[PDB]
Amino acid sequence: TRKESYAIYVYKVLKQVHPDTGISSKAMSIMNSFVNDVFERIAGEASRLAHYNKRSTITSREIQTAVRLLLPGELAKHAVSEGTKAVTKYTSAK
Amino acid sequence: LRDNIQGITKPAIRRLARRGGVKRISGLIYEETRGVLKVFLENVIRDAVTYTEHAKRKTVTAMDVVYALKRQGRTLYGFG
Amino acid sequence: DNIQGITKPAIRRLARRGGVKRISGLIYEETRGVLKVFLENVIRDAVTYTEHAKRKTVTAMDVVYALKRQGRTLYGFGG
Amino acid sequence: GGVKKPHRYRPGTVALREIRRYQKSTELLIRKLPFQRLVREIAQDFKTDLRFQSSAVMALQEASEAYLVALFEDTNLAAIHAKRVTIMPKDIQLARRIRGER
Amino acid sequence: KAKTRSSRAGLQFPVGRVHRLLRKGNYAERVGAGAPVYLAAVLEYLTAEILELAGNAARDNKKTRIIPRHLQLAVRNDEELNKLLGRVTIAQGGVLPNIQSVLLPK
Amino acid sequence: EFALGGRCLAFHGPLMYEAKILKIWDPSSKMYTSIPKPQKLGEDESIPEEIINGKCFFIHYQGWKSSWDEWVGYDRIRAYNEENIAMKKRLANEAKEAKKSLLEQQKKKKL
């Protein structure tokens, strides 16, 4: 019965961006399926990379080689940058 | 039932083509298109009745439809 | 200029294998740019893969691997 | 003397007007019930008595109108390719002879 | 007192969830700690650029909420999000308004 | 005769046109009957005074929109009978002769 989805999380980041704007539920589902799909593509490529390099673990590195192999053009640079500063804050806060 | 392809009326095939930005639809297109709708809807629905049976379900689910569209490459957002 | 190394008669040979009987003259230089941008896509991914193995040399395996990503698999060179 | 003449937009004005009308609509075009039936007879051939949700149909449509409006779009470019504004069955065919379904 | 991993990373998307999923997804045998943090970091970005662009689209059509339509504009107007979401067909999107130059009246 | 919703042939310039009778007007009662019931003229409804003293009919031209709907008296309205249909054919032939004269004068203008 419990349905797991990214409802409140995308809503939060929406207010972080625009703390005045509503969202449609169908449009939400567009967002949820979209983040699920891009998550699948980034995680799959990563799994592959690993299996090619005879590794066995999905390091933050793979997710990068991946984000830079999937996300196109600039969308990547800004993804990397934000992912690197995010993992930097994760290791700084331990 | 039978021969309901004619339900995609010309008035509509046009409206779609009109949507697609065409201005003059030659006749002999209304038949071609319906044929294209029935090769697409075929494959998708086939890959959906295969998914349907695998789950031993009977009710073709919208969930299956989306997975089917993915296989062929035409992913659809808005349903799951 | 290494691009101009893809010579006309070579583009003509590609057209012949492609079944073209009369090649415009302005095609030759369009086929270069299209060629470049495409190679510039594979080789890019070929190298992302390369600098993931911390390898400095690229392999044909990484090349067909980048093709698999792009979509156009290549049989005959490994994998 | 002066005989009337009705106000008729010239061939193409009504066309482009409903083009601007329809390229702002997101509403589906092919009508629902007519489409729903399109499937029950396109499915009966793959499995009997396959029920269908009222969402599978809506999805299998959104996916269809989307597929068709794309193909028409490449059909048009293909029609303009021969310096013509009329689309032809060959166009839907050249287009599809290049996407690799044919 | 237990804090969440997202506040450790400074994110809004869940880093915890994206770990489970990564694990049960069996994308690979072992998953490290920083991999779900990075993925949540990239997903929120992509969810943000797309939401911003949707916000730029909506106000234009003077609509408070964000209907699925706006999400298409945002995606088809942008040339990056369009390569990404390029074989994707959003629900109730319509198409980018466009008519060819030869179809215009003289 | 004339009936509500029935066929009629009417003047319009020099030519004959088929029409539907939607309302029937009586000058004595300052009233008209309509089709989906006696009623008077509305706030925005009026009849030209040249015919309003005679028995009027609000008519709708076939093949033409509701902007062409108008009130006509016995001068401008006739019953739909074979005599009126025949003189309608005759005036259609007169319009055809006028169009032929148009063609002749324009082809002499080209020369």
Side-chain angles (χ1 to χ4, degrees), chain A:
Chain A
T1 308
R2 289 179 67 96
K3 267 50 183 177
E4 293 171 348
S5 89
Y6 293 99
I8 297 89
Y9 308 108
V10 176
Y11 189 92
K12 292 174 179 180
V13 65
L14 176 54
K15 300 323 178 66
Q16 188 274 331
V17 171
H18 293 121
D20 59 356
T21 310
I23 185 68
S24 174
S25 72
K26 176 69 169 187
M28 192 73 268
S29 164
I30 288 291
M31 294 298 102
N32 171 76
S33 64
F34 156 72
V35 298
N36 284 14
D37 189 359
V38 298
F39 153 74
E40 190 276 331
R41 305 220 293 269
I42 294 169
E45 171 49 40
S47 76
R48 291 191 184 92
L49 286 168
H51 194 278
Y52 298 121
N53 300 29
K54 293 179 179 179
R55 298 306 194 89
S56 302
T57 175
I58 294 302
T59 66
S60 307
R61 188 163 190 268
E62 271 97 16
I63 292 199
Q64 180 160 324
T65 309
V67 63
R68 182 161 57 94
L69 200 88
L70 295 174
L71 271 63
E74 293 177 350
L75 261 187
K77 310 184 184 303
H78 293 255
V80 180
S81 72
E82 295 302 320
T84 45
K85 183 180 68 65
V87 300
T88 300
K89 189 175 181 305
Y90 186 90
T91 68
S92 71
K94 277 74 69 177

Side-chain angles (χ1 to χ4, degrees), chain C residues 8-63:
Chain C
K8 192 186 64 181
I11 300 156
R12 288 176 58 75
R13 282 189 290 266
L14 293 190
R16 291 306 202 268
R17 188 158 278 173
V20 176
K21 186 183 175 173
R22 215 167 166 273
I23 310 107
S24 172
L26 277 57
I27 271 288
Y28 301 117
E29 183 178 2
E30 173 86 354
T31 302
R32 300 208 171 93
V34 165
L35 182 63
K36 170 177 174 301
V37 61
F38 163 79
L39 279 284
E40 193 198 14
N41 279 346
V42 180
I43 307 164
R44 178 188 301 100
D45 284 355
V47 79
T48 302
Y49 283 180
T50 288
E51 53 177 342
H52 180 70
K54 303 163 183 176
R55 267 189 288 99
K56 302 179 180 58
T57 203
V58 300
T59 67
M61 186 64 72
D62 290 351
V63 176

Side-chain angles (χ1 to χ4, degrees), chain F residues 5-17:
Chain F
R7 270 177 295 183
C8 63
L9 302 170
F11 286 147
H12 194 95
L15 302 181
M16 296 299 103
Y17 306 96

Side-chain angles (χ1 to χ4, degrees), chain B residues 2-4 8 15-22 24-26 29 32-33 36 40 45 49 60 62, chain D residues 16 19 22-23 25 27 29 37-38 41 47 50-51 53 60 65 67 72-73 76 86-88 93:
Chain B
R2 278 280 57 90
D3 181 65
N4 294 180
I8 304 151
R15 300 195 306 277
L16 293 179
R18 286 272 169 271
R19 182 164 283 183
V22 301
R24 281 178 52 89
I25 305 281
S26 167
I29 280 292
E32 200 70 3
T33 51
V36 172
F40 173 83
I45 296 176
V49 66
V60 167
Chain D
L16 275 297
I19 301 299
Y22 276 22
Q23 278 195 356
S25 61
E27 177 187 356
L29 296 318
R37 297 196 294 265
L38 177 63
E41 78 178 28
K47 200 168 170 295
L50 287 163
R51 288 188 153 193
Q53 286 177 350
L60 194 38
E65 301 206 310
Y67 164 47
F72 278 133
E73 283 179 357
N76 201 357
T86 308
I87 68 184
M88 294 299 291
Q93 294 170 20

Side-chain angles (χ1 to χ4, degrees), chain F residues 40-88:
Chain F
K40 309 201 75 178
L41 278 171
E43 294 88 3
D44 56 353
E45 293 182 293
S46 53
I47 296 178
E49 293 293 297
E50 293 85 16
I51 56 167
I52 206 176
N53 63 6
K55 197 174 301 170
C56 297
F57 308 90
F58 194 68
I59 58 162
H60 171 69
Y61 287 100
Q62 188 178 4
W64 286 82
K65 287 192 295 294
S66 66
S67 81
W68 295 98
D69 283 20
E70 59 167 335
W71 293 95
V72 296
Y74 291 169
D75 184 23
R76 293 197 59 178
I77 203 164
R78 278 80 63 194
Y80 192 83
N81 52 350
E82 172 55 40
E83 298 84 16
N84 291 322
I85 300 169
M87 61 79 71
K88 171 179 176 178

